[PDB]
Amino acid sequence: LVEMVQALYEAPAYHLILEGILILWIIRLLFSKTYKLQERSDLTVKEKEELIEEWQPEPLVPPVPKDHPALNYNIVSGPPSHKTVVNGKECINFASFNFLGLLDNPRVKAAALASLKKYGVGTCGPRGFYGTFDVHLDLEDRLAKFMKTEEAIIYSYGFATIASAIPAYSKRGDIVFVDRAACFAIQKGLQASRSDIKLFKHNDMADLERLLKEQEIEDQKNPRKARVTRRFIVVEGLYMNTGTICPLPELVKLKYKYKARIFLEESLSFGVLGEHGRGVTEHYGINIDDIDLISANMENALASIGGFCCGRSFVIDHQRLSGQGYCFSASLPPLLAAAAIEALNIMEENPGIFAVLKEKCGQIHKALQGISGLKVVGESLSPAFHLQLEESTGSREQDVRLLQEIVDQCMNRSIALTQARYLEKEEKCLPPPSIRVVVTVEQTEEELERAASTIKEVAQAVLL
């Protein structure tokens, strides 16, 4: 073989370069996987116009049945409050998420009126372009102090709060372990981001542990990818669809065991749970710093339009420049912000109203127990819980119709109830039809007993 090498070295350069390009040609041919036919056909212009004229588009909106219950809207002839007027009939409000009863507090109205005289109704611009008022900064500081956190950010719409907070931190290729029975806002937030969603059973830490261990195995498969993948656990403090609280301590321990941050939704528990109404964290005593991001809205308890997210500056300062509902939308009107600030002052002044709400929820939950055709779904500490059908028929339409018949009978009996509404096609895990019951510090004990008796008799009559 040495003689061959010597002869090749004695060969001219052009011969060797030609042989090299020939070898490259051989490689190209051997790796020419695609097979071609040299057959090209182009459509004739007449055929193209025939296709253009033939095509007929579907109608923009499909024909809607006239039997849809959601088509009929309840018309309230006045402010939605205790002793309201629904459909021209006087009723007691058991359907509106106003727990603390701050909607009609005269101090809130006075503060809103003062700020309305000072600033007006509209802000007329995003937060970047002359849309930031001093009331917005005051409200953000008030929220930060009240929640014992470093920073808070306020959005002008409750849905947008979480639907824009979640996509900001979660990107494509990440892992999100979200509870199964999570509200539509969280579902749309998770759809906006393109990360991989893992769903676990409602309040089952066994399933969370199992999923985390499976992800740990997959990380052991490839360390380089596992170095650049982030893991989040999105849970709600007091669930909307189910009405059950979440077990924080186990979640926190799993966080510190498996290196996955926690996003908490506190729309329902922000102003009802804990001694001072700081949410589920105070109710459990877990430290505020353990949870990365805590979201809520100012609409249920504080009785004003908006929402907010709170946490350390490290996580919050990102939303100011990456949140869609924040960067590309007008800011909250000043009067709503002033109403929120006054409501915060009232909440901080006397913290016994949380205890009053707790005792009234206990009374109504105890009284309601005993319905033959309806089962109570929720927990004793929840202000809003569900009444579901004990014996479910074959189809959902009949269940909805029976529940609506019960609701109408109750409404004619001076108790105002609403049924939980969902998008049937869109919801991932679609809850069973249920009657929503909401408890307020405004309702006295006697009205609670009367409402229990009324719904009891109506259910017994209708189901039989």
If the CB atoms of residues 183 and 381 are measured against another protein, the closer one turns out to be 183
> What binding mask, one character per residue, do residues 243-282 give for another protein by CB under 8 A, x or -?
-------------x--x-x---------------------
- CA–CA separation, 98 vs 339, rounded Å? 14
CB of 13 to another protein, least distance (A): 42
CB 23, min distance to another protein, A: 31
When binding is defined by CB under 8 A, the residue of 107, 142, 159, 346 that contacts another protein is 159
How many other CB atoms are found less than 10 A from the CB of residue 197?
17
Which one of 82, 92, 93, 190 is in contact with another protein (CB under 8 A)? 93
Among 9, 33, 38, 57, binds another protein (CB under 8 A): 57
* 456 binds another protein, rule: CB under 8 A: no
Partners of 197 in beta bridges: 176
Q: Does 463 bind another protein (CB under 8 A)?
A: no
Smallest distance from the beta carbon of 275 to another protein, in angstroms?
24
Residue 299 interacting with another protein (CB under 8 A): yes
Restricted to residues 109-148, the positions that interact with another protein (CB under 8 A) are: 109, 112-113, 116-125, 127-130, 132-134, 137
Between residues 201 and 257, which has the closer beta carbon with respect to another protein?
257
Shortest separation between residue 391's beta carbon and another protein, angstroms: 26
Applying CB under 8 A, the span of 13-21, 156-164, 375-383, 394-402 interacting with another protein comes to: 156-164
Spatial separation of the C-alpha atoms in residues 253 and 257, rounded to whole Å = 6
Stretch that binds another protein, among 274-282, 391-399, 415-423, 444-452 (CB under 8 A): 415-423
Which of 52, 206, 217, 464 is the binder for another protein (CB under 8 A)? 52
357 with 342: CB under 8 angstroms? Answer: no
Looking at the Cβ atoms of 412 and 460, the one nearer to another protein is 412
Site size for another protein (CB under 8 A): 111
Question: Identity (one letter) of the amino acid at 427?
Answer: E
CB-based burial label for 314 (10 Å; 0-12, 13-18, 19+): exposed
Side-by-side strand order, sheet with 89-93: 84-86, 89-93, 415-416
Instruction: Note whether 202 binds another protein by CB under 8 A.
Output: no
Q: Degrees (nearest 5) of the Cα angle 241, 272, 157? A: 65
Cα–Cα distance for residue pair 69/396, rounded to 1 Å: 12
Q: Is residue 292 within 8 Å of 235, Cβ to Cβ?
A: no
How far apart CA 205 and CA 446 sit, in angstroms, is 40
Residues 306-325 that bind another protein (CB under 8 A): 312-315, 317-318, 321, 324-325
> Residues 140, 146, 147, 169: which binds another protein (CB under 8 A)?
169
- 277 vs 325, which CB is nearer to another protein? 325
Residue 392 C-beta: closest distance to another protein, Å: 22
Eight-class DSSP state of 30: H
Report 379-398 residues binding another protein (CB under 8 A). Answer: none
Map tokens 């189809």 to a residue.
395
Q: Smallest gap, in angstroms, from Cβ of residue 446 to another protein?
A: 22
CA pseudo-torsion sign 431, 267, 376, 412: negative
Residues 343-362 that bind another protein (CB under 8 A): none
Which of 73, 217, 220, 464: binder of another protein (CB under 8 A)? Answer: 73
Residues 6+ apart with CB under 8 A from 171: 193, 194, 195
Side-chain-facing half-sphere of 110: CA atoms under 13 Å: 4
Q: Counting contacts by CB under 8 A, is residue 283 touching another protein?
A: no
CB of residue 262 vs another protein: minimum separation in angstroms?
11
What one-character-per-residue DSSP string does 195-245 give? SEEEEE-TT-HHHHHHHHHHHHHHHHH-HHHHHT--EEEEEESB-SSS--B
Q: Rounded distance, CA 302 to CA 105, Å?
A: 11
- Considering only residues 229 to 248 of the shown chain, the ones binding another protein according to CB under 8 A are 229-231
Q: In Å, how far are 44, 266, 280, 347, 349 from 276, measured between CA atoms?
A: 76, 15, 11, 8, 10
Which x/- pattern over 5-44 shows residues binding another protein (rule: CB under 8 A)?
------------------------------------x-x-
Among positions 166, 185, 190, 238, the unique one binding another protein when judged by CB under 8 A:
185
Q: Give φ, ψ of 31 to 5 degrees.
A: -105, 20
Is 181 a binding residue for another protein by CB under 8 A? The answer is no
Nearest in space to 158 (alpha carbons), one of 339, 303, 318: 303
CB 54, min distance to another protein, A: 9
Closest CB 246 distance from another protein, rounded Å: 21
Paired strand residues for 207: none
Task: Please tell me whether residue 188 binds another protein under the rule CB under 8 A.
Answer: yes
What's the closest the beta carbon of residue 372 comes to another protein, in angstroms? 26
Q: How many CB atoms sit inside 10 A of residue 6's CB?
A: 10
CA nearest to 140, candidates 303, 320, 351: 320
User: 419: helix, coil or strand?
Assistant: strand
